[PDB]
Design a protein around this nucleic acid. Sequence first.
DNA 1: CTGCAGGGTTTTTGTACAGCCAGACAGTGGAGTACTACCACTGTGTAAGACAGGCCAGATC
Length: 78
Amino acid sequence: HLLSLTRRAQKHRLRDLKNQVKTFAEKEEGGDVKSVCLTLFLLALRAGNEHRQADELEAMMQGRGFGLHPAVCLAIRV
DNA sequence: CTGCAGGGTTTTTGTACAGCCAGACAGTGGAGTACTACCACTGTGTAAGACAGGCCAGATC
């Protein structure tokens, strides 16, 4: 399987689709491969009704808050 | 049928020029921020000690 292998064999196996995404992203988005594979990951996770992992991902990619503002904290407290 | 070994065969795996930058190491001067135990206060449960009164023994009615 692809998930247990090292990065050498993973990239060796996937280089075809890696350069496919490379050329398609330089075609459409103008030098943005990272956001292209991000939108691909989001669509592949939402098609399977696993919205939770997509929400965690979006909370990692410039996520609003690791920690909370003291205000809403006091709110929850009371 | 079986076990075993040259090579295949595809995958995996590390070593390989070659340049780049994230991430860390020291320390400074002490703030300071997070933590941990007082602390003032009574509500709730607890169980030792009153105790009384009921009962038997002493002695009586």
